[PDB]
């Protein structure tokens, strides 16, 4: 629910980063930083939030075959639709470790 901006002042953006100096519980300020490029997408030209994470509106998520993510998700209606995408398609090995692409 959020309003930093209550309790912040010189606040700014450049980019996809939020720069504001904000009170603490016992009276000094602090300034920080948060990239909001992981909260905020682009979706046909509005600014979302990003919806909250799949896990809490899908279940049964499972590997089907070698690079199939499977699960049931619940759609805007509520109803729990079957649902799978293929984790290669943006999932790499670098070099032993999965890396997103
Ligand atoms: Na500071
Ligand atoms: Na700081």
Redesign the pocket.
């Given at each position: 629910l959020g309003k930093f901006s209550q309790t912040c002042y010189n606040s700014a953006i450049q980019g996809s980063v939020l720069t504001s100096?904000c009170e603490r519980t016992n009276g000094g300020?602090?300034?920080s930083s948060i990239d909001l490029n992981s909260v905020i997408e682009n979706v046909d030209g509005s600014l979302k939030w990003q919806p909250s994470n799949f896990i809490e509106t899908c279940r049964n998520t499972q590997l089907a075959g070698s690079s199939e993510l499977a699960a049931e998700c619940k759609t805007r209606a509520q109803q729990f639709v079957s649902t799978k995408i293929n984790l290669d398609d943006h999932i790499a090995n670098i070099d032993g470790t999965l890396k997103y692409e």
């Open positions: 100096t300020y602090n300034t």
